[PDB]
């Protein structure tokens, strides 16, 4: 029993390394060069890797997994028994792979055009209109146009995608795809734990929402903003109103205290995508963490190709399963926003490098939330006025302090209900409580319930707004982002403590702290080898997810918001 198990794990690992490396390549090739040929080669590799998965997965299921002594081995075999899509019969298997490829392709190439005019792509054109335009109708054209073109086009594929991914999940022992995804956390109390954390951030969100709603009322007109209703989704400076920092200019707490045009600063000082990633690399090494290999700089795609190729622009980090080849694919724009994203992605790479000596089956984050959290933690320190000033992007009071906290809130707080919402919708789609006849209506029901937003244009049949969001056609679970935002503040707090910081948490900058880098390294090295509370414990000195660190970070702002909203008589929420 035990000898056969150990040998099977050694065999699974070495063969997986070769097969996964070959697949990642074909996948990378298509993502950075969308053509018919790279599509064909990828769909073929899908079949390959599935053969390997079926071979070892069928083998793994022959082991009674609670009859093994060694924990690590027993952990691996349990994972290999999950074939994921490879559990689907051949016919359905190919259909599903093609649907995924088609969805991903439709999304990444969609454009919005003006008749007899210029066509706009999502990055960087439509995101720029959403971030900079302050004209209601122009924002609506981009918001509606993007959903008209990308969202509607995904609808034809989604019902079949749902049926197939659910079938694969049940063939692996789950009730539906949502049950399968949630299992990545190995936390029975997950749904209730997350609902509690969401409820804790309500005072802070509702107050931010009310304050921003008043500022939008001032700028766009009493005729377009109901001070007691939901905010129109196209006015937050982001295509999905998931982060609101691009409308900072409309909501500055203390306009007397101007802030430097960071983007103009970055452009003026000649910052390039390569420089942005080099600065991220420097922050990681300052902590005593690992530098990205020379190979990374040679093979990554850090900016949109201008050679004629079409590519998947959405930022992503890649592990090629050989402990040497790690790359990032991003159509990088030179601005603060993308600087944070670059750190986010370098966090993924650091995790890859840290657990590279682990059996490939355990080469994952403690839980998907951890993987998403690493780069953001460093980006929190990078974002401080003190640190930006050191990069010569800012020129530098309590007013500048509340201004900074507002800038951070517009991103971090606003994102909490959106990140919660996405998979609330998907889990219900997966379990069958939301049918294809109610996809869109239930999406907006949740957009209203959690974010307090409404569509600027009433939705119609044929619309499928979820499809207009990357993670939906790409089938990338979203709840990891909600977890990430809660825990990254817990990591920030613990790391700051470790670093010897005293005073308000929001003033902490962990740059060059070897004590911080040590906790992150020890936790990251565990990969998926232990249940995540152990990694949580290693970083924070405790095992639970908690909203207290985020609440403490933003306490001064909550106090300011309550005073500001109450003097203006705001009715919190959207009755
Ligand atoms: C349980 O087994 C793990 C893994 O052992 C390795 O993988 C086996 C399948 C087989 O190939 C063994 O020869 C390998 O050693 C053990 O964890 C390893 O422990 C060593 C020494 O402590 C350490 O160098 C490795 O990094 C560990 N690897 C992992 C994946 O954690 C573990 O010691 C065994 N536990 C018991 C109860 O003996
Ligand atoms: N310019 C846009 C940058 C996109 C970066 C990122 N990309 C995903 C890719 C997953 C993938 C997995 C597998 C295959 C393909 C892709 C990720 O890294 O996980 C992403 O989605 N982030 C989320 C929210 C977010 C959490 N932190 C951030 C810090 C900064 C900005 C946003 C965020 C979102 O934007 O909704
Ligand atoms: Cl939407
Ligand atoms: Cl997840
Ligand atoms: Zn990520």
């Amino acid at each position: 029993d035990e000898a056969e198990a150990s040998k099977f794990v050694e065999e699974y690992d070495r063969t997986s390394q070769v097969v996964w490396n070959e697949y990642a390549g074909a996948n990378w090739n298509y993502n950075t060069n969308i053509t018919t040929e790279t599509s064909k080669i990828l769909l073929q590799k899908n079949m390959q890797i599935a053969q390997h998965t079926l071979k070892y997965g069928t083998q793994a299921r022959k082991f009674d997994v609670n009859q093994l002594q060694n924990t690590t081995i027993k952990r691996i075999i349990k994972k290999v028994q999950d074939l994921e899509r490879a559990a689907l019969p051949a016919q359905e298997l190919e259909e599903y792979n093609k649907i995924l490829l088609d969805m991903e392709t439709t999304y990444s190439v969609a454009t919005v055009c003006h008749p007899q005019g210029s066509c706009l792509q999502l990055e960087p054109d439509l995101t720029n209109v959403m971030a900079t335009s302050r004209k209601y109708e122009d924002l609506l054209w981009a918001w509606e146009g993007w959903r008209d073109k990308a969202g509607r086009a995904i609808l034809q594929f989604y019902p079949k995608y749902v049926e197939l991914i659910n079938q694969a999940a049940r063939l692996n022992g789950y009730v539906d795809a949502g049950d399968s995804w949630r299992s990545m956390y190995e936390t029975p109390s997950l749904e209730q734990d997350l609902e509690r954390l969401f409820q804790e951030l309500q005072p802070l969100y509702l107050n931010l929402h009310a304050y921003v709603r008043r500022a939008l009322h001032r700028h766009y007109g009493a005729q377009h903003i109901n001070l007691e209703g939901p905010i129109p989704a196209h006015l937050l400076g982001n295509m999905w109103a998931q982060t609101w920092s691009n409308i900072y200019d409309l909501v500055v707490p203390f306009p007397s205290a101007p802030s430097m045009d960071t983007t103009e600063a970055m452009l003026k000082q000649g910052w390039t995508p390569r420089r942005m990633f080099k600065e991220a690399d420097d922050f990681f090494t300052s902590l005593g963490l690992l530098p990205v290999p020379p190979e990374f700089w040679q093979k990554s795609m850090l900016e949109k190709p201008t050679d004629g190729r079409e590519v998947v622009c959405h930022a992503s980090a890649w592990d090629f399963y050989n402990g040497k080849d790690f790359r990032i694919k991003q159509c990088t724009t030179v601005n603060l926003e993308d600087l944070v994203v670059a750190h986010h992605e370098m966090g993924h790479i650091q995790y890859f490098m840290q657990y590279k000596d682990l059996p490939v089956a355990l080469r994952e984050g403690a839980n998907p939330g951890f993987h998403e959290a690493i780069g953001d933690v460093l980006a929190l320190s990078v974002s401080t006025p003190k640190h930006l000033h050191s990069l010569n992007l800012l020129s530098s009071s309590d007013e500048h302090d509340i201004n900074f906290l507002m800038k951070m809130a517009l991103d971090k707080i606003a994102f909490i209900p959106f990140s919660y919402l996405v998979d609330q919708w998907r889990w219900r789609v997966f379990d069958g409580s939301i049918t294809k006849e109610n996809y869109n209506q239930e999406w907006w029901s949740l957009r209203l319930k959690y974010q307090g937003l409404c569509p600027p244009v009433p939705r119609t049949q044929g619309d499928f707004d979820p499809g207009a969001k990357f993670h939906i056609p790409s089938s990338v679970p979203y709840i990891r982002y909600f977890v990430s935002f809660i825990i990254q503040f817990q990591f920030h707090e613990a790391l700051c403590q470790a670093a010897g910081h005293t005073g308000p948490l929001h003033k902490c900058d962990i740059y060059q702290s070897k004590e911080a880098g040590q906790r992150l390294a020890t936790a990251m090295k565990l990969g998926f080898s232990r249940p995540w509370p152990e990694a949580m414990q290693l970083i924070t000195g405790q095992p639970q997810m908690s909203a207290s660190a985020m609440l403490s970070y933003f306490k001064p702002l909550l106090d300011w918001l309550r005073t500001e909203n109450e003097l203006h008589g705001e009715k919190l929420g959207w009755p």
Side-chain angles (χ1 to χ4, degrees):
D1 242 327
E2 204 67 39
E4 246 173 68
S6 203
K7 187 159 79 76
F8 172 74
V9 160
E10 295 163 348
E11 270 164 43
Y12 173 75
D13 189 54
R14 48 176 80 97
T15 53
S16 285
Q17 283 186 50
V18 183
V19 175
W20 293 14
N21 170 263
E22 276 169 26
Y23 175 73
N27 192 21
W28 169 272
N29 284 352
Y30 153 84
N31 270 258
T32 59
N33 197 352
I34 297 183
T35 64
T36 302
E37 198 186 300
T38 51
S39 272
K40 300 290 180 180
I41 296 165
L42 175 56
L43 297 175
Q44 189 262 300
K45 289 292 162 189
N46 248 318
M47 254 34 215
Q48 186 179 321
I49 183 158
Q51 293 176 194
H52 173 268
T53 303
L54 186 61
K55 179 173 178 173
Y56 288 85
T58 303
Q59 234 139 273
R61 289 176 175 184
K62 294 177 311 211
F63 289 95
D64 196 312
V65 222
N66 286 290
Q67 201 184 320
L68 280 56
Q69 305 280 36
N70 187 290
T71 278
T72 289
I73 292 157
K74 175 175 158 128
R75 190 165 176 82
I76 300 182
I77 290 171
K78 187 188 163 177
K79 192 148 184 295
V80 182
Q81 296 182 330
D82 189 344
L83 312 179
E84 290 184 354
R85 72 181 71 184
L88 293 169
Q91 180 178 290
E92 279 98 309
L93 178 53
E94 71 187 10
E95 175 166 33
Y96 181 57
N97 291 349
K98 182 181 169 38
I99 279 162
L100 293 178
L101 183 87
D102 284 353
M103 291 209 281
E104 179 62 83
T105 297
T106 306
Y107 179 96
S108 297
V109 313
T111 60
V112 183
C113 324
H114 310 250
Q116 301 94 91
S118 54
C119 292
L120 286 78
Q121 292 176 315
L122 187 67
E123 309 215 308
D125 316 315
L126 303 174
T127 46
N128 188 65
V129 174
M130 294 310 290
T132 65
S133 176
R134 297 298 180 257
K135 296 184 79 160
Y136 199 98
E137 295 300 319
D138 293 359
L139 285 170
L140 179 54
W141 175 88
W143 185 91
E144 181 65 47
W146 179 245
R147 289 166 175 68
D148 284 351
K149 294 307 282 317
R152 291 188 176 160
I154 298 304
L155 185 56
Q156 73 167 147
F157 305 105
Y158 219 70
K160 202 73 190 175
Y161 153 79
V162 168
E163 163 186 313
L164 289 175
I165 192 173
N166 273 345
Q167 187 180 344
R170 293 188 316 270
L171 289 166
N172 285 300
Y174 296 102
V175 179
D176 58 75
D179 181 31
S180 181
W181 291 2
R182 290 191 297 276
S183 87
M184 287 183 279
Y185 294 87
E186 312 184 314
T187 300
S189 60
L190 189 65
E191 297 202 358
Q192 294 171 103
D193 291 338
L194 299 184
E195 177 84 45
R196 276 192 288 275
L197 295 165
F198 173 76
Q199 289 302 318
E200 313 254 0
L201 268 132
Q202 273 282 276
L204 199 29
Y205 178 64
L206 296 179
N207 273 285
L208 176 66
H209 180 280
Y211 174 77
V212 171
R213 179 176 53 195
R214 171 69 57 172
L216 290 177
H217 178 272
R218 255 143 48 213
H219 181 90
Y220 292 105
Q223 292 287 354
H224 305 302
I225 297 305
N226 178 350
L227 294 166
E228 298 188 300
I231 302 170
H234 67 308
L235 309 176
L236 293 308
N238 177 275
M239 183 54 90
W240 305 277
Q242 72 190 59
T243 44
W244 308 348
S245 70
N246 296 315
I247 61 166
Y248 175 75
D249 60 296
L250 301 181
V251 314
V252 191
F254 296 96
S256 63
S259 207
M260 210 161 110
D261 183 329
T262 57
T263 291
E264 238 223 22
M266 288 173 78
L267 289 165
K268 231 267 149 180
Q269 331 222 347
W271 279 58
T272 60
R274 175 142 185 161
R275 164 83 175 270
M276 293 163 76
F277 285 93
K278 284 275 179 174
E279 296 296 347
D281 192 52
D282 176 69
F283 204 120
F284 279 98
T285 53
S286 82
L287 299 186
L289 294 176
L290 306 162
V292 297
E295 193 176 350
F296 170 96
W297 302 107
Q298 301 163 349
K299 309 188 173 162
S300 294
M301 188 199 88
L302 304 179
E303 68 204 341
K304 196 164 204 164
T306 56
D307 70 325
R309 295 180 289 151
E310 271 225 81
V311 300
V312 176
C313 270
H314 195 90
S316 58
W318 299 61
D319 187 347
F320 286 76
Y321 300 106
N322 69 347
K324 268 68 138 54
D325 195 350
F326 318 98
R327 324 170 189 179
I328 287 169
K329 181 195 55 46
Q330 192 177 314
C331 301
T332 308
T333 292
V334 180
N335 56 44
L336 242 191
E337 180 157 34
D338 249 15
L339 181 59
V340 171
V341 177
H343 282 74
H344 174 86
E345 294 307 324
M346 287 288 275
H348 282 313
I349 300 296
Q350 183 67 215
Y351 223 138
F352 296 157
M353 296 192 290
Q354 288 289 342
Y355 61 49
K356 75 191 180 74
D357 297 314
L358 275 178
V360 290
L362 304 178
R363 290 188 201 172
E364 283 165 47
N367 79 41
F370 277 56
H371 228 303
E372 300 304 335
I374 306 305
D376 287 20
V377 166
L378 278 63
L380 284 172
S381 284
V382 167
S383 296
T384 56
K386 186 142 354 180
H387 192 97
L388 289 171
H389 178 259
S390 72
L391 297 173
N392 208 30
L393 304 179
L394 276 189
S395 44
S396 313
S397 50
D398 275 350
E399 303 196 355
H400 273 294
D401 204 38
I402 287 293
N403 277 357
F404 168 64
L405 281 170
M406 173 62 64
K407 170 53 180 262
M408 295 303 295
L410 291 162
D411 282 327
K412 306 298 181 181
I413 295 303
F415 186 67
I416 287 299
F418 179 84
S419 65
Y420 189 69
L421 170 178
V422 178
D423 281 355
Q424 291 305 328
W425 179 84
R426 264 198 296 216
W427 294 341
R428 292 182 58 226
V429 167
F430 288 156
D431 79 4
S433 49
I434 295 170
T435 73
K436 78 161 194 199
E437 68 206 337
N438 303 151
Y439 283 162
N440 220 55
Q441 301 92 308
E442 290 307 310
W443 167 261
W444 281 104
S445 297
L446 294 169
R447 287 274 265 169
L448 170 67
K449 176 178 181 181
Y450 294 116
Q451 285 182 283
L453 304 174
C454 58
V457 174
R459 322 313 295 139
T460 61
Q461 195 263 328
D463 285 321
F464 180 57
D465 302 319
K469 176 59 191 169
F470 177 81
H471 304 69
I472 297 299
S474 297
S475 182
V476 176
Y478 212 77
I479 201 69
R480 53 192 54 179
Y481 302 107
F482 171 87
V483 172
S484 173
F485 274 50
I486 297 281
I487 75 184
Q488 69 187 239
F489 279 91
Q490 294 179 252
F491 298 170
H492 185 61
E493 183 181 70
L495 264 36
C496 292
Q497 182 275 341
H501 173 80
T502 64
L505 178 58
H506 73 272
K507 279 175 166 153
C508 168
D509 175 3
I510 68 167
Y511 186 79
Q512 213 181 115
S513 177
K514 301 301 183 294
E515 293 66 54
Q518 190 47 50
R519 292 196 175 182
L520 289 177
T522 301
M524 287 190 279
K525 286 183 161 70
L526 290 181
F528 189 64
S529 72
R530 304 291 315 181
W532 72 256
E534 294 193 30
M536 174 62 80
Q537 181 92 65
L538 283 174
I539 298 167
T540 69
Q542 65 79 58
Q544 307 189 319
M545 284 187 281
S546 175
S548 70
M550 186 176 209
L551 294 179
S552 146
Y553 182 105
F554 286 113
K555 173 56 181 172
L557 183 71
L558 174 67
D559 289 343
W560 186 87
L561 281 169
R562 279 181 168 152
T563 296
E564 173 71 5
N565 289 337
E566 154 196 315
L567 88 64
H568 288 290
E570 313 289 0
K571 146 66 89 80
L572 299 183
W574 36 94

